[PDB]
Amino acid sequence: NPDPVEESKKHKLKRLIPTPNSYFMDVKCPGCLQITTLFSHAQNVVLCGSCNIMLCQPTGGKCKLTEGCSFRKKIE
Amino acid sequence: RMYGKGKGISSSTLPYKRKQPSWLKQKPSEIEDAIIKLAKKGQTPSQIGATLRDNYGIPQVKSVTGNKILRILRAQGIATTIPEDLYFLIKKAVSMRKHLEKNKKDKDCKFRLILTESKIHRISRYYKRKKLLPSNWKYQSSTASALIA
Amino acid sequence: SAGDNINAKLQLVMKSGKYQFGRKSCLKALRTGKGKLVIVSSNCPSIQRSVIEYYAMLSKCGVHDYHGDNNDLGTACGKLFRISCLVITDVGDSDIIK
Amino acid sequence: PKKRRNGGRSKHNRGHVNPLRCSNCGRCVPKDKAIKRFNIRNIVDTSAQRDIKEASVYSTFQLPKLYIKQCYCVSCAIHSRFVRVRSREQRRVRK
Amino acid sequence: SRRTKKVGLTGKYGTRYGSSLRKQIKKIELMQHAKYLCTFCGKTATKRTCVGIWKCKKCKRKVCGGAWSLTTPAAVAAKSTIIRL
Amino acid sequence: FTKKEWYDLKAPKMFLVRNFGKTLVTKTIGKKLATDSLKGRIYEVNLADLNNDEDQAHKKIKLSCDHIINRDCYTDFCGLSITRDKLCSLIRKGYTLIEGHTDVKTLDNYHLRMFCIAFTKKRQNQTKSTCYAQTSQIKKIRKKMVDIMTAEASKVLLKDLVKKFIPESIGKEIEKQCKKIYPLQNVLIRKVKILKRPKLDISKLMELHT
Amino acid sequence: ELVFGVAHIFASFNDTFIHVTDLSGRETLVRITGGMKVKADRDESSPYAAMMAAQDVAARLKELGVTAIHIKLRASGGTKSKTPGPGAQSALRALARSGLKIGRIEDVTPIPTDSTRKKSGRRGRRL
RNA sequence: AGAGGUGAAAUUCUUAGAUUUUCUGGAGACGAACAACUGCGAAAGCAUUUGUCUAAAAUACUUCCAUUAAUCAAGAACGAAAGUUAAGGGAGUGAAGACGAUCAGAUACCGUCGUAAUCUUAACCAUAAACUAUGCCGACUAGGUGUUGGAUGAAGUGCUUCCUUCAGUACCUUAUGAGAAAUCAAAGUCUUUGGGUUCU
């Protein structure tokens, strides 16, 4: 029954209601205490505001990110 | 797909939420100012939106400000005279023609050049059916090298 | 893409900044010191490129040897005539300086 | 009436395959259609291996092996009984 | 308007000599009378002066070349091999 | 015939048995010195019967008769090759084989061309039927292996180059580095050919014979 | 004291060449083949002819003084055929039985990494 | 002292040393084994290495434009092999041809040789069982086994497998689906007959 379908996350993009798989997050690089926004499935390299350091490596998917930091989904 | 085979359904699908994301406290005035500055520094609107999303964290500029990026770019009067897709097609055709001139034995490059110029003519016909491209515009294949302005 | 980047920067300055092409104009710009960057085509006659480099090194202005000939330099500038030498009086919002 | 679903060869997503030459008759046959036998065989029968061992030294000498890799056209393979005619239903079975 | 269907510059020969001979001489007269790129000044103004000499109308500079074209494949290949080193 | 006399064949110092066979030459009459004829002939001899170990029976060395004194020929390294049966046994359907070759000169100005061959491994948890590798990985492996077989064959002399062929150190090192790109099974220098050699120096020939 | 020669064995669906030289490959000691061991214009490739060829060369090697022999097997050539002819079996058999030391055996038939065109048309032989 | 070759043979080469062994140099060709019911390409077709140039596809995208699209008489690009023209090349194979055999005959099948051709360059030619004998675009309809290229999540050991998914690519079974049947997951959703379009 296709209306109240609940576990269509494993379904390919453009499900019954097409919703993108990407999202946005904030990264707290350890020892840097800086604020910036970051896109999952990004395509460019980024630099922090406080201390100039790389954060994510642009690849064909969700990037590699750095060795550490605390990265949290910023969906409200 | 226009030429060849393969459906290739890969694309980007916008989220259901049409409004500005709630977390975004950014203001449309500086969004437009940044878009103008970035276009002035010189980038096509597609990659303008790309770097806007990646480095400024403002997805779907149409959500932040109630219109499209090429629309504001035109409203500022600084939009280019040749649309992005037509310009890129012309650039690719120019490059492959330059290559063909040296290697005229590249039948495959000849075939692909024919396809590219067919696309150019169809796209230009559409763009001049719209008023946003002069009626006398033709794209003869000689001056296309400098036509990139 | 060793020439693609410089061609793109040239296209950007042609739109934004002010420039001048021609041996006489570029020589005058170097004399007055208003030149910031001089582009020399690979086709430039040896004497002309020599005097250009001497003027530029006197006036502390950079010289960039174009990868193409004067036809290619004109095409890159968007003109339909040979150029063979360029002076950038000012750079607009272009990264050609570095 | 299309005796075989694959047309007697193994060509798919392909226009042309380079032919090889039958090891028996020398006729050109497409590589995917040719019947290939990679036979690994001794130089000598077991009786002669015993004699080679007893006329050899190192007390561990191992008789070399022949790797031949023949390929045959349909007619040559059928005549050499490398393949059988088989029945209509058994024709589908490959292994 | 178009003056000849296919004879081209060989129309000066009328009906004399064979058709094959006229076509063969046309093929190379086309490139013997053409203008070539002067790599020294960049202007396509190099014309044949004599059987193996090519002069640029702008440079006033002349260069040894082929009988009917500024360059021949055998010479350009040799130059390429030399410059490879 | 009755006018032919035996000659002994000697092997260089780094080898084991040092006397691997006899050769025949006709009489020394006329302008035929019967030593010019003996000079510069090639002997293809296995390593099993040269170092008395079975595990190296798959390789054969070429020795070129370089000097003759009295009655024995001393020879020198002239080439290397693995045997056909082993080469064919190494090739099985389901794996991609890597082939590479390079030209390299040693400190002795000894110009060599070396061909090495490799195969892809199956690892343990694959549970598949094929071990094919992407052409990009093929290219990377070939580049890495050409560089490796060039560097350590160029920074070493010919004698120690041969004495490092003997333990196939090249294959061990190529594995130790290529574990991190694609697992490879038995990889060895398939063949070594002497492209050109310096003028004969009897001094160093006898130095490596003694 | 053990002295070694090299026997190039050539089995090619016709006369089986038996060719013993020294280690270098020059200085041929004895070449017998199978043509002179049978005078029927046939059976040149036969085991019958190969066996007498092999015992004859073994006798001559014994009288020459070489007692150990290496083997180099060869089949036709790079275009004709890859499989050794009927005579190789009996050549090796008789060389073993004749009593001389047999050392190392190796297959050396010329194998083209190329594909130079072989005889007969694309239709091949019709017999 | 024979060697080639054959179902036997012969033509042919061969005491001036053939065939055979080994080495050196040259030449043209080809690019095996890996090599697959695998990949790429509109089709023809495309397999030695490296470099440069060039394009394509899939995937990922909260990037841009916003109907720009589908199919197409005329017209255009490409179009195996053979063939034609002109230079070069010319090893091997080899339409023609010449021999030797077989046969009643054999101008054929077989064998020895061999011109054109095959190869490169520059032009023509525009045809093949150019075949999946199946035009292109779109929607829907079923399970399983694989396999190629991406992307997602997790677990054996920074490394590798499994899960999901897109796009190719085959195969097996199944049809109260079709078909004259062979068979077909399209050749189905057709007398319960009309998605669009071209050709015959």
D27 touches strand H (CB under 7 A): no
Which candidate from F4, F23, F57 shows the least CB-CB separation from G24? F23
* Interaxial angle between packed helices C23-32 and C46-59, expressed in degrees from 0 to 180 and rounded to the nearest 10: 20
Give the structural domain span for B133: 80-149
d(CA C71, CA E78): 26
Give the structural domain span for A32: 1-76
Task: Find how far residue A37's CA is from the centre of its chain.
Answer: 9
Pairing outcome for strands F184-196 and G4-10: unpaired
Give the structural domain span for D35: 1-95
Same domain for B149 and B86? yes
Which candidate from G99, G105, G126 shows the least CB-CB separation from D64? G105
Please tell me if residue C71 touches chain B, with a CB cutoff of 8 Å: no
d(CA D16, CA B69): 50
Residue B128 falls inside a structural domain: yes
Q: What is the largest CA-CA distance in chain D?
A: 63
Number of domains forming the structure of chain D: 1
Residue B9 falls inside a structural domain: no
d(CA B72, CA B76): 6
The secondary element (H helix, E strand) that includes residue F104 is strand F97-105
Among 3.40.190.80, 1.20.120.1200, 3.60.110.10, 3.30.420.80, name the CATH number for the domain at G1-127. Answer: 3.30.420.80
d(CA A20, CA B13): 6
Give the structural domain span for F25: 3-210
CATH code where residue B135 lies:
1.10.287.10
Name the β-bridge partners of C21: C86
Instruction: Count the Cβ atoms, other than its own, within 10 Å of residue F83.
Output: 18
Whether B54 and A46 lie within 8 Å, measured CB to CB? yes
Number of domains forming the structure of chain B: 2
Residues 61-90 of G with CB under 7 A from strand H: 72, 74, 79-80
Which long-range CB contacts under 8 A does D4-11 form with residues at least 24 apart? Answer: D4/D91, D8/D33, D8/D74, D9/D33
Residues of C whose CB is below 8 A from B149: 11, 14-15, 78
Residues of D whose CB is below 8 A from F48: 58
Same domain for B87 and B138? yes
d(CA F200, CA F205): 8
Residues 28-87 of D with CB under 7 A from strand H: 31-32, 36, 38, 69
Residues of F whose CB is below 8 A from D60: 54
d(CA G5, CA G87): 20
- How long is the CA G28 to C1' H18 vector, in angstroms? 17
B131 touches strand H (CB under 7 A): no
Query: By C-alpha distance, which of C77, C70, C40 is closest to E43?
Result: C70
The structure tokens 């109308």 sit at: E57
Inter-residue contact F60 to F40 (CB < 8 Å): no
**Burial, C60: exposed, middle or buried (Cβ in 10 Å; 0-12, 13-18, 19+)?**
exposed
Residues 41-80 of C with CB under 8 A from E: 41, 43, 45, 69-71
Instruction: Count the Cβ atoms, other than its own, within 10 Å of residue C57.
Output: 12
SS3 state of residue F15: coil
CATH code where residue A3 lies:
2.20.25.100
Same domain for B75 and B98? no
Residues of G whose CB is below 8 A from F25: 27
Q: In Å, how far are B24, F2, G60 from F21, measured between CA atoms?
A: 89, 20, 20
d(CA D29, CA D23): 11
Same domain for B149 and B84? yes
SS3 state of residue E8: helix
The secondary element (H helix, E strand) that includes residue F138 is helix F135-154
Number of domains forming the structure of chain A: 1
**Eight-class DSSP state of C53:** H
CATH code where residue D64 lies:
3.30.1740.20
Return left, alpha or beta for F106; rule: phi > 0 is left, psi -120 to 50 is alpha, else beta.
Answer: beta
d(CA F96, CA F133): 7
Return positions of chain H under 7 A from a protein CB.
1-10, 19-23, 28-51, 53-70, 77-79, 85, 91-95, 109-112, 121-123, 132-134, 137-138, 146-153, 156, 160-173, 181-184, 187
Residues 144-203 of F with CB under 7 A from strand H: none
User: In this structure, what token pair is assigned to residue A48?
Assistant: 């922090």
Whether F54 and D67 lie within 8 Å, measured CB to CB? no
Pairing outcome for strands G4-10 and G68-74: parallel
Query: By C-alpha distance, which of G75, G111, G67 is closest to G91?
Result: G75
Name the β-bridge partners of F19: F10
* Structure-solving method: cryo-EM
d(CA B49, CA B43): 10
G17 touches strand H (CB under 7 A): yes
Domain boundaries, chain G: 1-127
Same domain for B75 and B125? no
Whether D64 and F85 lie within 8 Å, measured CB to CB? yes
Number of domains forming the structure of chain F: 1
